[PDB]
């Protein structure tokens, strides 16, 4: 269960790295 | 200061606290001086001679009242204050000399002696050799040695304006 | 760091040091300009390369550098 | 020969150089300006001839080398500010 919260660690990494820069470049190209 | 109550206080306390304030002034740690001075109760700061002399000496030093600072050498409410006061007098001699350097487009010697609070022309000559003066060719210490657009810094500031405007 | 076109015009050089006059190439300010249709076509070709979401201030700073 | 900064000529200096008198150096300088060999102005109250340009003169190899060193200094300054502007505006700079 607590190493399932380690699953939550990798979930946090997924939100942080994958989606933030995704939206950033998405809105840049949307301005273009 | 810690063991308030359970203790009857010592009459020497105020004297020794004033001596500590003199020590802090001599070493020129003004922030710590004021911080500890704030520990003394109000009426102790305002009335007790042992706490009045240190604070008054700092007041005179900040104002520039070096005459009264020197007269503190005669005041000395407790004779033990001499040690921490002599070094302060020497530092104040340096500070007064700095004042003389910046001001006094020209100054003579016979009166500069009293200005620097010295009592011997040999001491005057030694001190002039210290740092360096013109010795008064006409008996006057003429230490009257008094563009460049900050283009780089201004360009940095303007680029900062542009970047703060364009990160919108 | 420069335009691709260098324009020259031949002109006789009357040397002040008496050397014989000889034909030489003289530079003339050359720049690239487009008709309306040429601009439309080139903009279509550069639709995905040219960056237009820069801002006037950013473009002018780029011009300065 | 005088540099680009201290190129102010006094009537006494020009008189000594040309073996003329301060009362004729003034006419000489105006004649120079009229013929167009030099550009500048005259302040006779202070007897100083301000100059800003002289006819281009032939240069020797050493003079060309010195001009090259000056050009190197200029190029270093230009490169320094190119780098400064680029680094400071890197974010916005396209």
Q: Do C65 and D94 touch (CB under 8 A)?
A: no
Task: Evaluate whether B40 touches B53 at the Cβ level (below 8 Å).
Answer: no
Task: Give buried/exposed letters for C13-42 (b at 16+ CB in 10 A, else e).
Answer: eeeeeeeeeeeeeeeeeeeeeeeeeeeeee
Q: Do B165 and C61 touch (CB under 8 A)?
A: no
Whether the CB of B165 is below 8 Å from some CB of chain C: the reply is: yes
CA triplet D33, D39, D45: central angle to 5 degrees? 75
Closest CA to B161 of C57, C65, C62: C57
A28 CA: distance to closest CA in chain C (Å):
8
D6 CA: distance to closest CA in chain C (Å):
32
Give the other-Cβ count within 10 Å of D78's Cβ. 10
Which structure tokens are listed for D50?
Answer: 């301000």
Which contacts (CB < 8 Å, 24+ apart) does range B58-62 have?
A: B58/B25, B58/B30, B58/B33, B61/B25, B61/B92
Chain A hits for C53, CB-CB cut-off 8 Å, are 28, 31-32
Task: Evaluate whether B58 touches B33 at the Cβ level (below 8 Å).
Answer: yes
Q: Do C51 and A31 touch (CB under 8 A)?
A: no
Resolution of the solved structure (Å): 2.9
CA triplet D36, D37, D39: central angle to 5 degrees? 70
Contact: chain D with chain A (3+ CB pairs below 8 Å): no
Pairs of CB atoms within 8 A across C/D: 20
Whether the CB of B167 is below 8 Å from some CB of chain C: the reply is: no
B161 CA: distance to closest CA in chain D (Å):
10
Which structure tokens are listed for C64?
Answer: 């300065």
Interatomic CA distance for residues B14 and A26, integer angstroms: 71
Interatomic CA distance for residues B101 and B109, integer angstroms: 14
Give the other-Cβ count within 10 Å of B66's Cβ. 19
Q: Where are the domains of chain B?
A: 1-164
Residue D11: alpha-carbon gap to chain centroid:
18
Give the other-Cβ count within 10 Å of B124's Cβ. 20
Question: What is the chain C residue with the closest CA to B163?
Answer: C58
Task: Evaluate whether B124 touches B113 at the Cβ level (below 8 Å).
Answer: yes
Question: What is the chain D residue with the closest CA to C62?
Answer: D93
Q: Do B159 and C55 touch (CB under 8 A)?
A: no
Residue B81 is given by DSSP the state G
Phi–psi pair at D83, nearest 5 degrees: -60, -45
Q: Do C58 and B166 touch (CB under 8 A)?
A: yes
D42 CA: distance to closest CA in chain C (Å):
31
CA triplet D88, D91, D94: central angle to 5 degrees? 105
Residues of chain A whose beta carbon is less than 8 angstroms from a beta carbon of chain C are: 28, 31-32
| Beta-strand relationship, B140-141 and C7-13 | unpaired
Residues 6 or more apart whose Cβ sits within 8 Å of residue B3: none
Residue D92: alpha-carbon gap to chain centroid:
39
Q: How far apart are the first and last CA of chain C?
A: 11
Contact: chain B with chain A (3+ CB pairs below 8 Å): no
Q: Do B159 and D88 touch (CB under 8 A)?
A: yes
Residues 105-164 of B with CB under 8 A from C: 159, 162
Closest CA to C27 of C13, C4, C3, C7: C7
Q: Which approach determined this entry?
A: cryo-EM
Task: Evaluate whether D52 touches D32 at the Cβ level (below 8 Å).
Answer: no
Of the residues C53, C55, C58, the best mutation for testing chain A's interface (the one with the most A CB atoms within 10 Å of its CB) is C53
Chain C hits for A32, CB-CB cut-off 8 Å, are 51-53
Which contacts (CB < 8 Å, 24+ apart) does range B153-160 have?
A: B155/D81, B155/D84, B155/D85, B155/D88, B156/D84, B156/D88, B159/C61, B159/D85, B159/D88, B159/D89, B160/D88
B106 CA: distance to closest CA in chain C (Å):
51
């Amino acid at each position: 269960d607590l190493y399932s919260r380690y699953k939550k660690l990798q979930q946090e990494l997924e939100f942080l790295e994958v989606q933030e820069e995704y939206i950033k470049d998405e809105q840049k190209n949307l301005k273009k | 200061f810690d063991y308030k109550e359970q203790l009857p206080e010592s009459a020497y306390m105020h004297q020794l606290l004033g001596l500590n304030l003199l020590f802090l002034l001599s070493q020129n740690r003004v922030a710590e001086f004021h911080t500890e001075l704030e520990r003394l109760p109000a009426k102790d700061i305002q009335t007790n001679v042992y706490i009045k002399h240190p604070v008054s000496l700092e007041q005179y030093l900040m104002e520039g009242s070096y005459n009264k600072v020197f007269l503190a050498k005669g005041n000395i409410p407790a004779e033990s204050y001499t040690f921490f006061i002599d070094i302060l007098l020497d530092t104040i001699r340096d500070e007064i000399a700095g004042c003389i350097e910046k001001a006094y487009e020209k100054i003579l010697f016979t009166e500069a002696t009293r200005i620097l609070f010295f009592n011997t022309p040999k001491k005057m000559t030694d001190y002039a050799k210290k740092r360096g003066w013109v010795l008064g060719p006409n008996n006057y210490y003429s230490f009257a040695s008094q563009t460049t657009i900050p283009s780089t810094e201004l360009a940095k500031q303007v680029i900062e304006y542009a970047r703060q405007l364009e990160m919108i | 760091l420069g335009l691709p076109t260098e324009a020259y015009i031949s002109v006789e050089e009357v040397h002040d040091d008496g050397t014989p006059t000889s034909k030489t190439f003289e530079h003339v300010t050359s720049e690239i300009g487009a008709e309306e249709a040429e601009e439309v076509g080139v903009e279509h070709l550069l639709r995905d390369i040219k960056d237009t979401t820069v801002g006037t201030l950013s473009q002018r700073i780029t011009n300065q550098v | 020969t005088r540099p680009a900064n201290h190129r102010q000529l006094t009537f006494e200096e020009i008189a000594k150089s040309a073996k003329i008198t301060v009362n004729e150096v003034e006419l000489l300088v105006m004649k120079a300006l009229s013929v167009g060999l030099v550009k500048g102005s005259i302040d006779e109250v202070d007897k100083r001839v301000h100059m800003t340009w002289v006819q281009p003169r032939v240069l020797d190899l050493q003079q060309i080398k010195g001009m090259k060193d000056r050009l190197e200094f200029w190029c270093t300054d230009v490169k320094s500010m190119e780098m400064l502007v680029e680094h400071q505006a890197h974010d916005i700079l396209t």
